[PDB]
């Protein structure tokens, strides 16, 4: 029996060698491998394969997965491969070949009475996104990010108060405690950032012991050499991360003095290009350093025709100052340093000069604009953009996970990690997903008329599902705590209801560990022109006219 390759693609989704355009971008992925046995794929339905004695076996629950996503085309930092995905006890069980071993060959994901099925044929499946620059301005940002395909939210805030409006900080044990309790209500994994700015280390150890998994150093609370030094000493002590928004005003020193204060210690520099904040005009040079994990926030991704007008006014709304801060030269170079692997994470800067539901779409807009301007990456091997795709997906998945010491639980589709997965139709890849799974349960998805005969008639819009409800939600999300808070029983003392995860490895991670984004360039910024150079070569780019993943998809 044979089947033409087109019929095969139509039936089971694309296989080795076939290519797929990502949304309306110029980006194309090519299937690298397919873990199936042709003739033995599993499909669910009337007269299909997943039926008793056939693709479905006789095993007890312990011997089969709880869920199988059939014929998924996985896009992750490690490969673009066709495979069945088995999820068991809310975790990724295996990436391989699903079925019944009693009659099928090569079965690595056993299907039994206890197995539900999500049909992934023709879809692309990714890990859930991880946004590490959240301002907890309002709880509404949770569903907003979740709908976008972001499953983990790290940041700080207490709601719509001046401190949170400006900085990602949940100040003090009482607000940290209230925010950990509030986290149980939200369908995304959450970790909190405390206020890192103080020169007395005990006031920081207290916040850490309270539950924060990191500390934000923000210039609005005084990003001085002494404050930065204190937070780094505590972070080294308690294995928690330091996120930095530096002294734009150059009040306490220049970017080299902040650099001398970090003293080669591990730190995550937020909005590293500097329009979102930092030493004017040269904060960007931080990406040269081995101990720096640099992210961009999103309003400057990618550089477009309206970018500068918009930002100059935006900054004025929230003169020599405005102008030293918003610069075309550093804005134009940031797209390219992303292209080059010199910037490692993308993040939002939620409702504080960034858009909470746009981390993934903008990351892809930047990959498209770079392919368009620069052509294929030196790393590319065939006639496709597979390497660039793995380089950029790593920026909102595995790299933020590693930066924040939670890559052991989330960040990629790998065995043993939490089953936070996003199912996409290729036409809507990166903009509107088909299904958002949190720890093994679907938590939000587009849903048509609740009274209709099928789930597809209009209006179709995002509605929270069973993994977003009460105690099933608590079972399917993680609250991340510091090792100290976990050890002191903060979870039990606050009666937190969700599953708890503990961060670790926040000091050991370095630039060489950012997947496909480890470049340490000899970067300079000219004091007078603000031009950015790496080894004397001008790093620049052109603003987009129009972007993909924009007007074809959105009602407003």
Partner 1 sequence: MELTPREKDKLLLFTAALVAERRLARGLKLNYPESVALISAFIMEGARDGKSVASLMEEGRHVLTREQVMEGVPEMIPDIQVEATFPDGSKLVTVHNPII
Partner 2 sequence: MIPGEYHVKPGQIALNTGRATCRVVVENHGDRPIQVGSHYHFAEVNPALKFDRQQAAGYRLNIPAGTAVRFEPGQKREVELVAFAGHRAVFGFRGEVMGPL
Nearest approach, Cβ of residue 110 and partner 2 (Å): 11
Nearest approach, Cβ of residue 513 and a second copy (Å): 30
Q: Which position among 76, 131, 184, 349 is part of the footprint of Ni ion (CB under 5 A)?
A: 349
Burial 205-227 (b: 16+ CB within 10 A, else e): bbbbbbbbbbbbbbbebbbbbeb
* Using rule CB under 8 A, residue 354 touches a second copy: yes
Q: Phi/psi at 139 (nearest 5 deg)?
A: -70, -15
Q: How many angstroms separate the CA atoms of 118 and 531, rounded?
A: 50
Which of the stretches 21-29, 390-398, 493-501, 536-544 binds a second copy when contact is defined by CB under 8 A? 493-501
Q: Of 184, 131, 133, which is closest to residue 157 (Cα–Cα)?
A: 133
Q: Which position among 81, 85, 137, 431 is part of the footprint of a second copy (CB under 8 A)?
A: 137
CA–centroid distance for 459 within its chain: 29
Q: Residue 546's CB: how many other CB atoms inside 10 A?
A: 8
Residue located via tokens 């795709």: 389
* Using rule CB under 8 A, residue 89 touches a second copy: yes
Residue located via tokens 């997943």: 50
* Using rule CB under 8 A, residue 94 touches a second copy: no
The pattern of x and - marking residues 35 through 74 that bind partner 2 according to CB under 8 A reads ---xxxxxx-x-xxx-xxxxx--x----------------
DSSP string for residues in 237-271: HHT-EEEEE--TT-SS--HHHHHHHHTT--EEETT
From the list Ni ion, partner 2, a second copy, none, partner contacted by residue 275 (C-beta under 5 to 8 A by kind): none
Q: Phi/psi at 20 (nearest 5 deg)?
A: -135, 130
From the list partner 1, partner 2, Ni ion, none, partner contacted by residue 245 (C-beta under 5 to 8 A by kind): Ni ion
Q: Which position among 365, 435, 482, 541 is part of the footprint of partner 1 (CB under 8 A)?
A: 365
Nearest approach, Cβ of residue 132 and partner 2 (Å): 26
Which of the stretches 93-101, 160-168, 397-405, 426-434 binds partner 1 when contact is defined by CB under 8 A? 426-434
Nearest approach, Cβ of residue 124 and partner 2 (Å): 9
Nearest approach, Cβ of residue 534 and a second copy (Å): 29
- CB-facing half-sphere around the CA of 200: CA atoms within 13 A: 4
The four Cα atoms 220, 226, 228, 230 give a dihedral, to 10 degrees, of -120
Which of the stretches 165-173, 256-264, 398-406, 533-541 binds a second copy when contact is defined by CB under 8 A? 165-173
* Using rule CB under 8 A, residue 3 touches partner 2: yes
* Using rule CB under 8 A, residue 453 touches a second copy: yes
Q: Which position among 54, 314, 486, 499 is part of the footprint of partner 1 (CB under 8 A)?
A: 314
Which of the stretches 142-150, 221-229, 361-369, 389-397 binds partner 2 when contact is defined by CB under 8 A? 221-229
331 contacts 276 by C-beta, under 8 angstroms: no
DSSP string for residues in 344-356: -EE---TTSSS-T
- Residues numbered 19 to 58 that lie near a second copy (CB under 8 A) are 44-48, 50-54, 56, 58
Q: Which position among 2, 451, 453, 458 is part of the footprint of partner 2 (CB under 8 A)?
A: 2
151 contacts 173 by C-beta, under 8 angstroms: no
- What DSSP element (H or E) covers 124? strand 124-127
Q: Of 389, 419, 393, which is closest to residue 95 (Cα–Cα)?
A: 419
The pattern of x and - marking residues 439 through 468 that bind partner 1 according to CB under 8 A reads -------x-xxxxxxx-xxxxxxx------
Residue located via tokens 């690298």: 32
Q: Which position among 2, 4, 6, 200 is part of the footprint of a second copy (CB under 8 A)?
A: 200
- Residues numbered 100 to 129 that lie near partner 2 (CB under 8 A) are 100-105, 107
The pattern of x and - marking residues 491 through 530 that bind partner 1 according to CB under 8 A reads ----------------------------------------
* Using rule CB under 8 A, residue 35 touches partner 1: no
- Residues numbered 262 to 281 that lie near Ni ion (CB under 5 A) are 277
Largest CA distance in the chain: 75
* Using rule CB under 8 A, residue 11 touches partner 1: no
- Helix segments in 83-153, DSSP class H: 141-147
Which of the stretches 307-315, 328-336, 343-351, 444-452 binds Ni ion when contact is defined by CB under 5 A? 343-351
Specify which residues 127 forms β-bridges with: 421
Q: Which position among 278, 464, 521, 548 is part of the footprint of a second copy (CB under 8 A)?
A: 464
From the list partner 1, a second copy, Ni ion, none, partner contacted by residue 512 (C-beta under 5 to 8 A by kind): none
31 contacts 17 by C-beta, under 8 angstroms: yes
User: Six-digit token pair at 108?
Assistant: 């690595």
88 contacts 96 by C-beta, under 8 angstroms: no
Q: Of 542, 517, 298, which is closest to residue 388 (Cα–Cα)?
A: 517
Burial 137-163 (b: 16+ CB within 10 A, else e): beeebbbbbbbbbbbbbbbbbbeeeeb
- Residues numbered 269 to 288 that lie near partner 2 (CB under 8 A) are 279-282
Which residues would be at the binding site for partner 1 (CB under 8 A)? Answer: 24, 140, 143-144, 147-148, 304-307, 309-310, 313-314, 317, 355, 357-358, 361-362, 365, 427-428, 432, 446, 448-454, 456-462, 543-547, 549-556
């Amino acid at each position: 029996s044979n089947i033409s390759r087109q019929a095969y693609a139509d039936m089971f989704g694309p296989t080795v060698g076939d290519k797929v355009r990502l949304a309306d971008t110029e980006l194309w992925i090519e299937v690298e491998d397919d873990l199936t046995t042709y003739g033995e794929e599993v499909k669910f339905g009337g007269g299909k394969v997943i039926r008793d004695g056939m693709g479905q076996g006789q095993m007890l629950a312990a011997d089969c997965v709880d869920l199988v996503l059939t014929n998924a085309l996985i896009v992750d930092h490690w490969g673009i491969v066709k495979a069945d995905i088995g999820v068991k006890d809310g975790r990724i069980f295996a990436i391989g070949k699903a079925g019944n071993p009693d009659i099928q060959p090569n079965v690595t994901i056993p299907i039994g009475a206890a197995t539900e099925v999500i049909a992934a044929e023709g879809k692309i499946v990714t890990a859930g996104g991880i946004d590490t620059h959240i301002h907890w301005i309002c709880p509404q940002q949770a569903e907003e990010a979740l709908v976008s395909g972001v499953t983990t939210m790290v940041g700080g805030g207490t709601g719509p108060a001046a401190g949170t409006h400006a900085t990602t900080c949940t100040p003090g044990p009482w607000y940290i405690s209230r925010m950990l309790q509030a986290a149980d209500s939200l369908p995304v994994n959450i970790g909190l950032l405390g206020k890192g700015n103080v020169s007395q280390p005990d006031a920081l150890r207290e916040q850490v012991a309270a539950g924060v998994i990191g500390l934000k150093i923000h210039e609005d609370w005084g990003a001085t050499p002494a404050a930065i030094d204190c937070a780094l000493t505590v972070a080294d002590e308690m294995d928690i991360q330091v996120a930095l928004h530096s002294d734009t005003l150059n009040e306490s020193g220049f970017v080299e003095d902040t650099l001398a204060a970090i003293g080669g210690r591990t730190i995550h520099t937020f909005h590293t290009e500097g329009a979102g904040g930092g030493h004017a005009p040269d904060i960007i040079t931080a990406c040269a350093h081995p101990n720096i994990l640099p992210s961009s926030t999103n309003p400057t991704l990618p550089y477009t025709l309206n970018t500068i007008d918009e930002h100059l006014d935006m900054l004025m709304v929230c003169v020599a100052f405005a102008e030293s801060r918003i610069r075309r030269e550093t804005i134009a170079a940031e797209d390219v340093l992303h292209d080059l692997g010199a910037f490692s994470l993308t993040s939002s800067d939620s409702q504080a000069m960034g858009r909470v539901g746009e981390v993934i779409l903008r990351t892809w807009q930047v990959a498209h604009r770079m392919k368009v301007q620069r052509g294929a990456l030196a790393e590319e091997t065939g006639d496709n953009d597979n390497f660039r795709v793995k380089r950029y997906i790593a920026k909102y998945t595995i790299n933020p996970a590693l930066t924040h010491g939670i890559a052991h639980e989330v960040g990629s589709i790998e065995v043993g990690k939490l089953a936070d997965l996003v199912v996409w139709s290729p036409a809507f890849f990166g903009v509107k997903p088909a299904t958002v799974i949190k720890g093994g349960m679907i938590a939000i998805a587009p849903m048509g008329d609740i009274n209709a005969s099928i789930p597809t008639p209009q209006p179709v819009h995002y509605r929270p599902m069973f993994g977003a409800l009460g105690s099933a939600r608590h079972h399917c999300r993680l609250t991340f705590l510091s090792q100290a808070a976990a050890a002191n029983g903060v979870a039990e003392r606050l009666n937190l209801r969700s599953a708890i995860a503990v961060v670790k490895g926040c000091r050991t991670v370095q630039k060489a560990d950012m997947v496909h984004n480890s470049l340490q360039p000899n970067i300079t910024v000219d004091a007078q022109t603000y031009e950015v150079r790496v080894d004397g070569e001008l790093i620049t780019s052109e603003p987009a006219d129009v972007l993909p993943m924009a007007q074809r998809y959105f009602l407003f």
